[PDB]
Design a protein around this ligand. Structure first.
Ligand SMILES: O=c1ccn([C@@H]2O[C@H](COP(=O)(O)OP(=O)(O)O)[C@@H](O)[C@H]2O)c(=O)[nH]1
Ligand SMILES: O=c1ccn([C@@H]2O[C@H](COP(=O)(O)OP(=O)(O)O)[C@@H](O)[C@H]2O)c(=O)[nH]1
Ligand SMILES: [Cl-]
Lengths: 393, 392
DNA sequence: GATACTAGATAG
DNA sequence: CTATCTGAGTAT
């Protein structure tokens, strides 16, 4: 096949999280493969993390609620329209109304591709127009065959077509490495860095646990990145938990020294973090996702850890519930390097951390296999090729 | 008596229901009679209806688990400590535990009054540390001499002491002078039911009614209070037609005739009484068993006749509930209330037309409602009755 | 069964 | 925490 013009549409806005990251990585790949790519997003709703990713140079903001004409032209200008998000249940009638409008005036030639990115129904039920989007769509992707998308909504709308293929949010792992990788001689093995967001399932509570019980009592330092301000702290606070908060402006005032509680950081720049991470001894990404929602998809923050040369420390459960991209075997059942964080036998998890904190050689060996495991499981070189073939089939 | 400091303590935390209403009504009566009051409540467990009543401006929350000092400072600062509830069984050790340490460190000079607002044994067991409290109480109330508390549990702990009876008093008078609209704004066709998602709050019976009569006759029905708690899976599974509006969408309530019953979950007490004082009729069929019934009505009951609407109470009930004055079955009076009979549901719909036609006969029946209820459970009569027992 | 009475997950 | 959502469990 030849070259096609792809329009990557984010109708929910640019949230600066997985959906933004995915859109971006998706952009870089079509481009890297000889394809014209525009990236449109609804500016109608504004988001906190609108600067975590570098995109202000090519993203094309539009305001459904007024610039309908502008939007209508953009979307109708391509061979493939990829929809990664839809308006949120908080936008004004105009916005949503005009978005439903766009779905009706797409040249029937164009090939609409919907990517459902959320898992739980609590999330899906916060969308507006998702049905008009799915109906008009020609190809549909989701994270799990057993997720609330394929199982709940999909059968709701269609009491009985169409085929919802599977996908994994790819990342050009090779590139992040050749940009942030470091020499083990430069990695403070004492810095334990967790990244995610103030959402119970990303597993920030457990990080706190693992610090007050093993990390801190060993002279180690813990930095928890990405916890936006939220009432969820109300809980954290008088739940009896010490920590120190830093605005992304106070990042240089963190106490990365011993016998110090959890150093927090509300929001961050992908790149800035990767850098910080690359010189970190152990990154922790502890999403404890429900098994109904897991299949082949690791989150971007899983990919970034192994990507920049730090020992990945993911949630044991998740590794058990995810199947490798090649042989389709469990993740936990591989010599990846991945220190599987054991919520129960934590002590055991801490032992493997100390075993590598002192053996620099072992380290490199563990992170090399980890880099390669993940690279093999969900790198953009494979995942987008697997998807593109589905779309163009 | 004179002037004393009162500390109304809600150990289970603010549940926003009757027990939460009782405390506020109690606080209002004490203050009104000039007694310094402070309303403490254990934050160790949050409940959804924490907005039903306004209290955010005075109530004082406490974390029994991490702020024990603060707690003990609060209960020992008063002459009479009133405990209306205890911690739940779902709480963590540090709570139930510190709650007890409290009970044991309460000055011996403070008079501890305990109000047991529960009925069944289930309920009388879904609480922790009750025994420690009852044992510490200088005074103990309950809703019925023939309940599970006096019979089952009391005899259990004490095979000494006395358990006086009481009623949950409300300022019927204060709620009139604010919501009691003019019979020229009372949309006779509206039928509002109050209570919550539990079989004995007669909600199943409502639906039936809006079906065998209300819906037919072109009327409309709204039932406020139905929370989508697990008890709701019963409504859905029994397949009943209803439309569910929250409080941000109370407006979009299709009020027009020929409609299913309009359900509204956890509502505001001030808003409810409002609409209810502009509504044709107020239903409340608390079909509570008799053993638990003795003289106590529910605030949902006393709030209907209070906002000048036509009170529809579950017949069975009024028959077991004795009148505060002569102690005679309620129902045998000219209460001005419709004794909703699940059996002769039509007869009930009759007295409803009979009174929803003559907009002059309606205004004269609700005037018997208010007075009869005022004489049975008003703050001035009851809290004076309770203050005496407490101070004896 | 009949009948009566009664919370874990997650997004913002 | 507060809000929207979903679909049994308990006891006799
Ligand atoms: O404050 C933040 C939060 C997240 N991210 C990045 O946004 C992506 C989020 O992807 P993932 O799917 O792991 O997170 P989720 O979208 O599920 O929140 C990752 O590249 C993060 O490093 C960021 O740059 N700053
Ligand atoms: O969603 C609700 C439910 C109830 N109530 C009020 O809470 C009290 C409940 O008293 P009652 O004893 O009738 O009910 P229960 O205590 O059994 O919940 C009454 O004043 C109701 O008006 C309220 O404000 N909002
Ligand atoms: Cl994603």
């Amino acid at each position: 096949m030849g070259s096609m013009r792809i329009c990557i549409f984010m109708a929910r806005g640019l949230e600066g999280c997985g959906v933004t990251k995915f859109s971006l990585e998706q952009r870089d790949w079509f481009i890297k493969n000889g394809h014209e790519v525009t990236l449109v997003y609804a500016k109608d709703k504004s988001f906190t993390r609108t600067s975590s990713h570098d995109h202000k140079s090519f993203s094309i903001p539009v305001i459904l609620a007024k610039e309908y004409d502008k939007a209508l032209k953009l979307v109708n200008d391509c061979d493939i329209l990829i929809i990664n998000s839809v308006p949120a249940t908080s936008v004004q009638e105009a916005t949503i109304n005009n978005y439903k409008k766009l779905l009706d005036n797409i040249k029937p030639s164009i090939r609409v591709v919907v990517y459902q990115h959320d898992h739980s129904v609590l999330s899906l039920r916060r969308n507006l127009g998702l049905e008009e989007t799915v109906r008009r769509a020609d190809v549909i992707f989701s994270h799990s065959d057993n997720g609330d998308f394929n199982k709940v909504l999909m059968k709701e709308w269609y009491p009985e077509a169409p085929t919802v293929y599977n996908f994994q949010p790819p990342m050009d792992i090779v590139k992040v490495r050749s940009t942030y990788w470091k020499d083990v001689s430069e990695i403070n093995m004492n810095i334990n860095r967790w990244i995610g967001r103030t959402t119970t399932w990303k597993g920030f509570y457990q990080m706190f646990d693992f610090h007050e019980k093993f990390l801190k009592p060993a002279g180690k330092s813990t930095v928890m990145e990405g916890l936006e301000r939220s009432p969820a702290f109300i809980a954290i606070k008088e739940k009896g938990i010490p920590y120190e908060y830093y605005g992304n402006r106070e990042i240089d005032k963190m106490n990365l020294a011993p016998n110090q509680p959890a150093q927090i950081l509300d929001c961050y720049i992908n790149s800035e973090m990767l850098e910080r991470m690359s010189k970190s001894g152990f990154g922790y990404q502890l999403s404890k996702l429900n098994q109904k929602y897991l299949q082949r998809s690791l989150e971007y923050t899983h990919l970034e850890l192994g990507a920049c040369g730090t020992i990945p420390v993911f949630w044991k459960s998740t590794g058990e519930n995810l199947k490798f991209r090649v042989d389709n075997t469990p993740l936990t059942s591989h010599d990846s390097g991945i220190i599987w964080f054991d919520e129960n036998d934590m002590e055991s998890t801490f032992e493997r951390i100390k075993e590598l904190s002192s053996d620099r050689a072992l380290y490199d060996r563990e992170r090399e296999k980890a880099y390669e495991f993940l690279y093999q499981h969900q790198d953009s070189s494979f995942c987008f090729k697997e998807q593109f073939d589905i779309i163009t089939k």
